[PDB]
Symmetry: none
Subunit: 214 residues, 4 copies
């Protein structure tokens, strides 16, 4: 009922119809429940940090650029969902404050550090979330020897401790180590899924999608 959804980089980079698709799902879940959405920087952030590093930015300043970019993507998503707070919170208190007036709150990053997965895990904990749904571009958590290679299946369920070990332990991560550690501390039922309207809906409805962690 208290959902933290995490939309990573790649997972909806500025395509009008796909964004409409995601928002519609989020709106649906919001009719029944209380949704927090953390968007990531996507192409936008990657691009700009790249360019900003190229121009000789401090890592801290890069960090700011990144957050900015997340906030922008977040704005874009908010356009699409009418029940969302039109304000992009800049911290969790703000995010929770807004949760008292709105069924959907949508934020980018906060602290200039580790990102999105970790950020949303922190948020889930902070607000005592019912379910942390981490919508990524892969289907779940995958074996030692992961990736898009041949020696690979996902784990349909996992313990926190298992997940920690698995990421303790290119290209994209996914789930961050600190995110996992945070999930272990928080004892919050997590999903790691292929981020599509259907799967998100399924995860909300407490079913077998991707990798359940509890």
């Amino acid at each position: 009922m208290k959902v933290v959804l995490s939309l990573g980089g790649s997972v909806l980079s500025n395509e009008s119809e796909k964004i409409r698709e995601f928002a519609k799902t989020i709106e649906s879940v919001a009719q029944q429940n209380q949704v927090f959405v953390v968007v990531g920087g996507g192409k936008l952030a990657r691009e700009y940090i790249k360019s900003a590093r190229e121009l000789g930015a401090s890592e801290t300043f890069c960090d700011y650029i990144g957050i900015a970019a997340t906030r922008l993507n977040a704005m874009l998503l908010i356009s699409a969902i009418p029940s969302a707070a039109k304000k992009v919170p800049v911290d969790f208190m703000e995010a929770e404050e807004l949760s008292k007036l709105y069924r959907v709150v949508v934020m980018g990053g906060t602290f200039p550090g580790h990102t999105t997965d970790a950020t949303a895990a922190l948020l889930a904990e902070f607000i005592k979330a019912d379910v942390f749904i981490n919508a990524t571009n892969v289907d779940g958590v995958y074996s030692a020897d992961p990736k898009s290679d041949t020696s690979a299946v996902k784990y349909d369920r996992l313990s926190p401790q298992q997940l920690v070990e698995i990421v303790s332990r290119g290209t994209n991560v996914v789930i961050d180590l600190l995110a996992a550690k945070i999930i272990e501390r928080s004892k919050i039922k997590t999903y790691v899924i292929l981020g599509t309207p259907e799967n998100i809906m399924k995860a909300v409805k407490g079913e077998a999608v991707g990798t359940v962690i509890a």
Copy 2:
């Protein structure tokens, strides 16, 4: 084992890391098998045709610019995969010729007409492909109309004839696959996939699993 992969527009528009991610998958599949890749115009083509129309191009000339663009994207992808033919074929005979010396061939468009899905369907048929993997930005083929709800969903498998019917009635999330592509798939009787184009799904589709919409 003979794979035709289709990477459409949107599906990797010039992001260094994402391209590295796609190449690495294609290279993996190429270690075991024989891969053809057909890239589309993406932002680049859309952008350039848009501008070219704005300046008063003939549709035929827009067509050329489009192919141009596809070929450029294709070159970009080839940088990333070391086992690819450094030539971008300009026709299927070339594409097949190159397939005899390389495990990966990557091409843009050919005939100035219907595109990418159809082009790659044609290529599959031409070379008698084992599997046509159509990596799009949606998850599979979708239901009646369609529009976003729970009772609207993808079809986990389909017959060619079914798929034809599905994209024979519209004129609309089913903006992918093309009608002529589907017709071509029906004629060719080649096992097709319609999937969300990610390295994982592509790998899964190669390994003959449940992804998106399987068509056979």
Copy 3:
């Protein structure tokens, strides 16, 4: 000596080297003088507003996204110039406050309304600027209508009142400078330039020379 520079949309959309080229010029001007820079939304804003409108945003909310975008471009530019305030000011008081600690201040938009030219004209007036340099993608202010021939040309100098008249009649290559910008320039009586935004021209305009259209 107090320079307001205006970099509009198009004028440096995220190309690493071109940005390095602009920064280096701004840093040069900053060695001797006091520089304010107002960047615009470019592709980024156009793109995002386009998408945001498509999704059914209020115009006010589009406005915010636009400002957002400008601010992001501005951040990008700041990476490039080491003598700039690492904060992007969100209003002119901030912008002037920061001008007391830094030789270069770089800002996006402020009020959700008319943009960049007007914004920078306002800023010039606010801080009593010595020179407002409006670096656009055209060469100066242009003649009757206008349309491309030899007898249609730029005006090498102008009075404020003249400029007002020139952009008081249209409703169209004179899509730059804004009407309110011109009105503001007239009120402020601040020496303005309207130029093709290149490092050379900017440097020339700073050094008080014949570039584009001088307005005084």
Copy 4:
């Protein structure tokens, strides 16, 4: 009367109205005379080579990508000019062949090597051009201590030999050394100018713009 025009990188990167502006001028010059146009890679080439290097391309392959990109920009320009050969020549013979049927020929690069200025200088020589107009983003050739800095004026005229010395001897070049050497050999009246419809027209009409070299 036989004009080689050189449009570099930056000088018209895909803006519909500015491209219309350039084409209109080129069309005008073509009413009276015989125009060759060499376009460069601009953002497009820079971007793609960047990405292609990033992905581990050979320098030769980069070279091809670059030419491709030039050819594309060239296509775009041709749309805008009706009296142009709809074919983008891939070599000078082709380029001259087409000159026999068309008043405007527009090409990208040819040999995978030094570029645009040099390419167009070569072309001018090859076809015995009347005037090589090199439309750049700076106003002319500038002093020892050039660039957008304070110790700088342009040279309103120059000898070939002078120009060679000057570039013998960031950021953008401009005029290439080999281009200058080629201009010296060819003894072809050259212009180095700020690439705008007006200046191009002026240069064609044999007037004082930028840096004349003869």
